[PDB]
């Protein structure tokens, strides 16, 4: 039975990991966009077009 438990646990773990990390990353991105859209001195490719994306 612990095989079933571990399978369910790690499936739920992977689901939570993917979902929560994607949501948190997108949320930080959106907050940054809100900070920069209201301050167009910063609404620039401030890190770089490829630098941030590559990282």
């Amino acid at each position: 039975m612990n095989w079933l438990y571990q399978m369910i646990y790690y499936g739920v773990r992977m689901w939570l990991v993917f979902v929560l990390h994607s949501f948190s990353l997108g949320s930080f991105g959106e907050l940054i966009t809100v900070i920069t859209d209201n301050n167009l001195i910063f609404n620039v490719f401030y890190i770089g077009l490829l630098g941030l994306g590559f990282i």
Partner: protein, 68 residues
């Protein structure tokens, strides 16, 4: 259509014209001889690029803040 006097510029006798002065030892100064002193802007072009960028950006910043 017009008499020869008007064309040649004189009725009877052609009058001598005083020639143009030259001012030896220096460049002529006329309305058309000014590019010797004033060329097209060539010294601060890259500064022009920078200042245009910064002007656009600062104007956009303050305009957006005012509008919001």
């Amino acid at each position: 259509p017009l008499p020869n006097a008007v064309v040649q510029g004189y009725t009877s006798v052609r009058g001598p014209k005083r020639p143009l002065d030259h001012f030896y030892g220096r460049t002529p100064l006329n309305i058309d001889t000014l590019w010797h002193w004033v060329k097209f802007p060539h010294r601060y072009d890259n500064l022009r690029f920078a200042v245009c960028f910064w002007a656009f950006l600062v104007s956009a910043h303050f305009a957006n803040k005012k509008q919001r």
